Design a protein around this nucleic acid. Sequence first.
RNA 1: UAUGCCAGCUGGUGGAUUGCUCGGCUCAGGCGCUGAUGAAGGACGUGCCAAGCUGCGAUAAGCUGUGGGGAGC
RNA 2: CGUGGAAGUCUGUUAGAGUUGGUGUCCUACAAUACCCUCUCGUGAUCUAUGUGUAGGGGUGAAAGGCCCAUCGAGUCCGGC
RNA 3: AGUCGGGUGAGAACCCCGACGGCCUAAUGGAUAAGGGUUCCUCAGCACUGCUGAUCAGCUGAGGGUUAGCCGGUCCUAAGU
RNA 4: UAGGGAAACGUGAUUCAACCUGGGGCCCAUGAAAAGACGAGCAUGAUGUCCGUACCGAGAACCGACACAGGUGUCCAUGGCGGCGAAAGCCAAGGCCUGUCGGGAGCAACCAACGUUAGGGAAUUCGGCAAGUUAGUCCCGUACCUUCGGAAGAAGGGAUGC
RNA 5: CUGUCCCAACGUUGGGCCCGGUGAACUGUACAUUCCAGUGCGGAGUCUGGAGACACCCAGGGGGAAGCAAAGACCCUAUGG
Lengths: 7, 143, 81, 46, 56, 82
Amino acid sequence: XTXPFXX
Amino acid sequence: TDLSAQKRLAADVLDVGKNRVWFNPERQGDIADAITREDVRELVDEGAIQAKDKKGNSRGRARERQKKRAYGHQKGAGSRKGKAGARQNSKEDWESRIRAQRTKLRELRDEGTLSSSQYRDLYDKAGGGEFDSVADLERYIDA
Amino acid sequence: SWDVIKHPHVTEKAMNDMDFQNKLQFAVDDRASKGEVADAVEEQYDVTVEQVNTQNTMDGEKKAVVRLSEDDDAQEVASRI
Amino acid sequence: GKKSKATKKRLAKLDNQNSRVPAWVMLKTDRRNHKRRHWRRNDTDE
Amino acid sequence: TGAGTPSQGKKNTTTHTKCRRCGEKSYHTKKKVCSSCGFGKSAKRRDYEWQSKAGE
Amino acid sequence: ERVVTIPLRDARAEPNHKRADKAMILIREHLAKHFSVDEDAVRLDPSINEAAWARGRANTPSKIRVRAARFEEEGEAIVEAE
RNA sequence: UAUGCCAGCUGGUGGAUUGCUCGGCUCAGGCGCUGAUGAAGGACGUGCCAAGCUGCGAUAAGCUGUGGGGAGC
RNA sequence: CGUGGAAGUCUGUUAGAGUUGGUGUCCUACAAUACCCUCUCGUGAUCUAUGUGUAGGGGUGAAAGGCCCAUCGAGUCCGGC
RNA sequence: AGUCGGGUGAGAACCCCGACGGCCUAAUGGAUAAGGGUUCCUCAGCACUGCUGAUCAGCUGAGGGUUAGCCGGUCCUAAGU
RNA sequence: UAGGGAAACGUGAUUCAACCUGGGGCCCAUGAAAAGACGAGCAUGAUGUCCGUACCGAGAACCGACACAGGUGUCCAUGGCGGCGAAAGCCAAGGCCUGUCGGGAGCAACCAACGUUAGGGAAUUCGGCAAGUUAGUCCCGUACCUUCGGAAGAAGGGAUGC
RNA sequence: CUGUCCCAACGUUGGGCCCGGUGAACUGUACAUUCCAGUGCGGAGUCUGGAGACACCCAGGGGGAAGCAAAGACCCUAUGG
Ligand SMILES: [Cl-]
Ligand SMILES: [Cl-]
Ligand SMILES: [Mg+2]
Ligand SMILES: [Mg+2]
Ligand SMILES: [Mg+2]
Ligand SMILES: [Mg+2]
Ligand SMILES: [Mg+2]
Ligand SMILES: [Mg+2]
Ligand SMILES: [Mg+2]
Ligand SMILES: [Mg+2]
Ligand SMILES: [Mg+2]
Ligand SMILES: [Mg+2]
Ligand SMILES: [Mg+2]
Ligand SMILES: [Mg+2]
Ligand SMILES: [Mg+2]
Ligand SMILES: [Mg+2]
Ligand SMILES: [Mg+2]
Ligand SMILES: [Mg+2]
Ligand SMILES: [Mg+2]
Ligand SMILES: [Mg+2]
Ligand SMILES: [Mg+2]
Ligand SMILES: [Mg+2]
Ligand code: NA
Ligand code: NA
Ligand code: NA
Ligand code: NA
Ligand code: NA
Ligand code: NA
Ligand code: NA
Ligand code: NA
Ligand code: NA
Ligand code: NA
Ligand code: NA
Ligand code: NA
């Protein structure tokens, strides 16, 4: 939810 | 046999750290049957239970160094770790000094050597930081 | 109406205070004061109570350690019951 | 912590409820304390 | 400082306690009010219709 | 009974901070082999222990003389420093 | 013929199934207020041995009377 | 020249507070925010215990929509359902 | 961070004694607040619990243990209720 | 001619936590209140009830679902060497071997922490990330700029043991 | 200034590996020794054609199972919030 999974 | 219980009791009766009480390895059986503080003191009087001696660091090498240093050695640039004013507090030093100087001046006055005024004049110069040590003070006084 | 003395607190440590300090230990009603514990003990066993220490036990009962005068003998008062 | 006298009577009681089912109740009923509580594991009120 | 496990350590304050009126450990000893029966706030007993389904 | 020199060069194959323990084993294994006895039956008088632990747990000697005797109704050696 | 596949047999694991009902669910008739004479509820007690439940209240699984009942408890 | 000892002053793993990099270790963890090293502050707008006040469209906010018991661009519980 | 002897035991790498070797120094020592609530001591145990085992135990069972005119509470008042 | 110690059962000194008592300085900040005590003697006697008191206080007794590498207040800040130091390192007193599974292989690859690497010396890389260099104390000496305070440990050079 | 690099080597400690004891989880439509091609809803261990293929087991680094984990946050849509 912040780009790369899950950053 | 579990003598741990006794160890706690012995340590208190002998009044020593638990780690110091010694139990004779050939008398475990007996020490085992020991139940009350009394039973313990008895085994203590029998020498079955004892308290090792506590050591203290040897101040020997210290004293040798203390000598050398009191004498002025072992205090070169390579042995100093703290800053200058750290090794000898300035204000403190100035107190030491200005006091000896005022003490000296005060003596010479009662003693008659100095007239109130000469004293006055000197005392002020002292408080004004005119004389390094007492010596330097006297030196100046002698014209 | 509650009673002051519930019963004798007989245990090893209770025996010692008896054989060695002329003390009787009781289980008394927890609303009772040392003074009330004193009287009761006197009127019950006919003795002279010198001092009374109390304690509120983890058993929800109040234990009183009663010390008798040198005229009375704990071991003896206790033996009759 | 400083416990009051009532708090104590309760703690006391809780302690007793913590005993086993007497040996004989077993024979009497021809054959479990569901209120057993550990000091560490469980937690009393207050 | 995490709001999680690390913030759990300071939790040693006593609030809710065995209530003198209802017997529930809901008496807030700092508020002197029971969250369960309402002792300390209301003479009447704390009770709401929403404690059960509307038709019941 | 005889006097033997035990090499403890193999305790180097063990992590250094533990040489002592390994050394102490090497000894039991050595005596057990050279006396035709089981390692269980090898008693090492504390002398040996202190010998091996002398310089700490990581500085055990590379050798060590030890005096061992053999005997009894099952076979077993008793040993000590020298 | 190892590792192994499929189905069965003996034993197990499991607790379905069948049978059973000291509990529920719903309908119906009767009846229907308690409390400062301190209720309802709760706490803590109370037993020879007593943890739970029930009962009871320092007269503590109970005390009294009247009636019923009956050789047991 | 000395005295004096000021400062949201300096150095500082004193205590204590903080949390920059390693994008290391961990990532069915020791841990639902940890470990190690590195790093910042450390007499002040300082840090901290306990007690106390402010309550949900409301608080609190040196303001990041931050925080209000692992819950926040409107907490939690039950109810409406 | 143990090792060699030995003790107890049906059973011992880890329960106990000695020696040797180490670890902790604002703490891995001493006294305590909160909080826990019997965990304290003793005896008897090992079905449960214990990162292996156990004769050991904060585990299981039974007993026991907390004594105050002069330490606290209690009294006073604080923010505030 | 209490107590305690097997015994001796000291005397002086320095620096001096505790405790006592003064002086100075600061505020666009002014640093509680009440009960109580004193003021106000002495003897003898009586009374002094009620509640807490065990233990832990933490890398197993607390919060974190756990015997959780996390979190959690106060006092001991004066034990010795060291040194500026409540610093490091080492060592007492006291505590501990329970930050609780062990045995075996010179113990391979591979991985975690880490030591040392010749010549070269940032060519690596988004970037010197990571690591390294420097270092304590004394002496000499110190640029631009500047709000004249600072810059500044600028830089640079020398010294250092017994 | 230096193993950041040329360009890697050797070493140290804890693992890794073997043995005793303790002992989970993720995941699982079924079948399953695959490989090269082809085909197919156009990104096949299973279809088609060929090739290869004796079984079982240990260790490894992770190529594939459009691997495991999450009813896509992007985008559109809903007479949604
Ligand atoms: Cl107290
Ligand atoms: Cl002055
Ligand atoms: Mg997002
Ligand atoms: Mg000065
Ligand atoms: Mg008392
Ligand atoms: Mg939160
Ligand atoms: Mg500052
Ligand atoms: Mg600083
Ligand atoms: Mg606060
Ligand atoms: Mg925004
Ligand atoms: Mg008990
Ligand atoms: Mg035992
Ligand atoms: Mg114990
Ligand atoms: Mg105590
Ligand atoms: Mg542990
Ligand atoms: Mg090189
Ligand atoms: Mg380049
Ligand atoms: Mg390049
Ligand atoms: Mg760096
Ligand atoms: Mg084919
Ligand atoms: Mg979707
Ligand atoms: Mg969008
Ligand atoms: Na009783
Ligand atoms: Na508890
Ligand atoms: Na009715
Ligand atoms: Na009962
Ligand atoms: Na001046
Ligand atoms: Na950090
Ligand atoms: Na709201
Ligand atoms: Na609802
Ligand atoms: Na010192
Ligand atoms: Na162990
Ligand atoms: Na290297
Ligand atoms: Na793969």
